[PDB]
């Protein structure tokens, strides 16, 4: 089950900052268009909102308003948002993400990086 992010955190932790930064630049390439900004991947994807918005921007979806919570007020809502974002990733043709939606909400860095990198790999050429 072991991947490159396991190897990164175990053996090359000083390479984490360039990994963060490249992914931050990628997400803000799209989120800036909505006047939104990510400063830190540790916490700012946990409520599931930006992941949903990002998928809308990347695939050009008509995202149904009643399919996610724009201002989630609980663990469970934040849980429905990430799951819906995962749903939209798979709708575009991506494999089901490795992390459970709860791992994102609980601010697991590896899980956050994995989800964002797989979007980077697919959508790095999208203007």
């Amino acid at each position: 089950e072991r991947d490159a992010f396991d190897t990164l955190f175990d053996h090359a932790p000083d390479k984490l900052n360039v990994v963060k930064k490249t992914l931050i630049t990628f997400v803000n390439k799209h989120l800036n268009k909505l006047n939104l900004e990510v400063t830190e991947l540790e916490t700012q994807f946990a409520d599931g909102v930006y992941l949903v918005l990002l998928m809308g921007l990347l695939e050009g979806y008509f995202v149904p308003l009643h399919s996610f919570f724009l201002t989630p007020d609980s663990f469970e809502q934040k849980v429905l948002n990430v799951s819906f974002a995962f749903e939209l990733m798979q709708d575009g043709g991506l494999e089901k993400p490795k992390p459970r939606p709860e791992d994102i909400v609980n601010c697991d860095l590896k899980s956050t990086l994995r989800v964002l990198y797989n979007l980077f790999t697919k959508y790095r050429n999208v203007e």
Binding site: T7, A12, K15, V18, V19, T22, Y117, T121
Partner: peptide
């Protein structure tokens, strides 16, 4: 070769 591949994407 996964870490090599990962860093070629994100160190470019």
């Amino acid at each position: 070769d996964d870490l090599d591949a990962l860093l070629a994407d994100l160190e470019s």
